[PDB]
Design a protein around this nucleic acid. Sequence first.
DNA 1: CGGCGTACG
DNA 2: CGTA
DNA 3: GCCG
Length: 325
Amino acid sequence: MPAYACQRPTPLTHHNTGLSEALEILAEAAGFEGSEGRLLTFCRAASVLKALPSPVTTLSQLQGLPHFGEHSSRVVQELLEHGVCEEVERVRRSERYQTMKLFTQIFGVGVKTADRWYREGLRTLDDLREQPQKLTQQQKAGLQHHQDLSTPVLRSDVDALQQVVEEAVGQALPGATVTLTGGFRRGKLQGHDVDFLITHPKEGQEAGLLPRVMCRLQDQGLILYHQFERSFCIFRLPQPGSWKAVRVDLVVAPVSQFPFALLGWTGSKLFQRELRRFSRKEKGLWLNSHGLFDPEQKTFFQAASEEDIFRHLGLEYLPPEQRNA
DNA sequence: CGGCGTACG
DNA sequence: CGTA
DNA sequence: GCCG
Ligand SMILES: [Br-]
Ligand SMILES: [Br-]
Ligand SMILES: [Cl-]
Ligand SMILES: [Cl-]
Ligand SMILES: [K+]
């Protein structure tokens, strides 16, 4: 079992779901306390279990697995022996965890803001609504739309939405294309946001495109909230006899960068962090969603495909549905 | 022990 | 600070 | 918390 998540296929559904969920509770709780290293270890350990070919039934099966040490192994041991891990349950029922989780679900609210509100004594969404002086306009929109944004969108919704986005994009710039990225490209049937990547086959024609797209979507009445090359929005999505708010991200890239942007926005979040860590630490190359830089030659690798990028990093190709780290 | 994605709004 |  |  290789040490980086980008070195191993990770499917969306797997054979260790309960174990991985428990470790991800501990990862989440570490992040709420600002312990990013511990968050990464617990996330990586969870992802190792997602990549295994069969269920873990005995503690011996953890021997030699990367990112399993004393703590993660004890968590698994307790789940295997008793069906529950006391540490995980203590986290689940703690006021700190429950409130930090609730607050960081709000669009516009990160750990730092949530922690500040927690220390100020706030605990519920209504607590925040009663103090609107404390909220940015972004947080006000996230709070108003929180209920809708808590419910998953289906792939059928995504497809109808893509058609709406494509019409606006085609008026903004004929020939420009829209590609579905994010979790739905990785095979999810349900999800909580929708990601689209926009480009044009003629290098440079995409300059200035995103404002033109947003203005047209706004004119069509589809934008419930928006604040360039990335737009993090709340869209109005049709529902039987009504509608609901959905989180939608729109990104523009020049076609020369499209393989890097697609690889970037397809995720998963942990996959991306692991891939960029691997690139820098193992290959000495600096990766982002624009390109791949050799700091010794001071050159950029001109990729024509995601397959090109994996080859250049010396990795076996992973299709998007095996990037669910 | 140091390191832990790398950007953009 | 927030977003991915 | 774990790797190297
Ligand atoms: Br590609
Ligand atoms: Br980036
Ligand atoms: Cl830490
Ligand atoms: Cl590292
Ligand atoms: K948030």
